[PDB]
Ligand binder design. Structure first.
Ligand SMILES: *[C@@H]1O[C@H](CO)[C@@H](O[C@@H]2O[C@H](CO)[C@@H](O)[C@H](O)[C@H]2NC(C)=O)[C@H](O)[C@H]1NC(C)=O
Lengths: 213, 213
């Protein structure tokens, strides 16, 4: 069966260039155009261009000419897209697609995340957030890590109810993530509630107990 | 270039109902139009092509239609796994273009946000920084706005906002706002209040604290 297999997550300097791969397996690789699609949050889906691996003939969205370069390797059943002079704009998930025959896209790849930033790996600081001094709401702030992700639980993940972990946001080059847990005002301070934060990238694993002020 | 316009970026539906996603082409694309579905953190999937034709591996709830430049994606007996963003694409002329995308959500009764204000941890203050955290939880509909007032004086400077996707279990929304600043200008002032303007309230809901206690 037809399967498109993309390369892995990229993190690059601004000004650098990246090269994404897609291995097409299960069909006659050379007969079919391969499509490149950009998915930016807030920017929807954007068609980058296509390449016909047989002769390596290319069709670029006039948008991306000079930013994107398609190459095909027909011995490896692989298609590459190089993005040059990387910027913040190029941070996105990139898909390759194969059309069913020649137009609308039947088969997609899993995508490639490409993040472009001046940032270097930074372990987060973890701050316990306890109420100002019936039902009770506590929090955990994870400030200034990189790269994504971090993973956060409450009491080793054994408090799953009333929990809100919010998507991280970028501030001053780095990620900031918050979580809130809710319990019955009866159940806390009485029982220990801890927030557990892990950052495999820095090998950070930290536990912070929420204590009364 | 051909502009695919999806008027509705959000659509409020519920299970066992029909929902119609609308797309218009800025020129004649004929019937060369396709529809894709995408769910958070997953590759797109082909639903419809040549505007009315269902691709294999797609539920009977999805159907395409066209009249002139007007293209409709229709979902009947709408289900939870149908909640996703829907894109239309024209393949009529190059470059291929996509609509803006439409996100399905499940409608429910409104709720005022549950709002909590957290002063900077002693940990954070001891490291040299200040962050004031305002949580607005389990509200509806998703649209909401947050103001920060320092001693009554509004501050838009240095606020970090984050939103959860619609809650899959209770179908509400929640967001977090972190007012960040330098410990100096923090220990300079006294009252810290965050106000929330949302649909369910006449008077903005406002949570505050004064520094020392
Ligand atoms: C296309 O892919 C093939 C297969 O990987 C590449 O052949 C490799 O060439 C490198 C360097 O010459 C060798 O180290 C490997 O042993 C080769 N791999 C195989 C499986 O033969 C080839 O280089 C690629 N074509 C181009 C022009 O890059």
């Amino acid at each position: 069966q037809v399967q498109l297999q993309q390369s892995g997550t990229e993190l690059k300097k601004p000004g650098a260039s990246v090269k994404i791969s897609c291995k097409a397996t299960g069909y006659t690789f050379s007969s079919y155009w391969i499509e490149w699609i950009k998915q930016r949050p807030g920017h929807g889906l954007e068609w980058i261009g296509e390449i016909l691996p047989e002769i390596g003939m290319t069709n670029y969205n006039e948008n991306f000419k000079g930013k994107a370069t398609f190459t095909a390797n027909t011995s490896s059943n692989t298609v590459y897209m190089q993005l040059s002079s990387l910027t913040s704009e190029d941070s996105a998930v990139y898909y390759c697609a194969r059309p069913y025959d020649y137009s609308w896209f039947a088969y997609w790849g899993q995508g490639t995340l490409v993040t472009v930033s001046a940032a270097k790996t930074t372990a987060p600081s973890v701050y316990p957030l306890a109420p100002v001094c019936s039902s009770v709401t506590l929090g955990c702030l994870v400030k200034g890590y990189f790269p994504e992700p971090v993973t956060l639980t409450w009491n080793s993940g054994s408090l799953s109810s009333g929990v809100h972990t919010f998507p991280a946001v970028l501030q001053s080059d780095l990620y900031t993530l918050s979580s809130s847990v809710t319990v019955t005002s009866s159940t806390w301070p009485s029982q220990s509630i801890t927030c557990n934060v892990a950052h495999p990238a820095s090998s950070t694993k930290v536990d912070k107990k929420i204590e009364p002020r | 270039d051909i502009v695919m316009t999806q008027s509705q970026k959000f659509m409020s539906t519920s299970v066992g109902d029909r929902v119609s996603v609308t797309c218009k082409a800025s020129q004649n694309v004929d019937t060369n139009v396709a529809w894709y579905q995408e769910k958070p953190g997953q590759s797109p999937k082909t639903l419809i092509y040549s505007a009315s034709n269902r691709y294999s591996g797609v539920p009977d709830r999805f159907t395409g239609s066209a009249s002139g430049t007007d293209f409709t994606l229709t979902i009947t007996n709408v289900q939870s796994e149908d909640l996703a963003e829907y894109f239309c694409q024209q393949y009529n002329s190059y470059p291929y273009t996509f609509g803006g995308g439409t996100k399905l959500e499940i409608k429910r009764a409104d709720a005022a946000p549950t709002v909590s204000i957290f002063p900077p941890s002693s940990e954070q203050l001891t490291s040299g920084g200040a962050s004031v955290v305002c949580f607005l939880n389990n509200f509806y509909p998703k649209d909401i706005n947050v103001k920060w007032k320092i001693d009554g004086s509004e501050r838009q400077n240095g606020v970090l906002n984050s939103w959860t996707d619609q809650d899959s279990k209770d179908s509400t929304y929640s967001m977090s706002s972190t007012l960040t600043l330098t410990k100096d200008e923090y220990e300079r002032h006294n009252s810290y209040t965050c106000e929330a303007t949302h649909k369910t309230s006449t008077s903005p809901i406002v949570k505050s604290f004064n520094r020392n206690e």
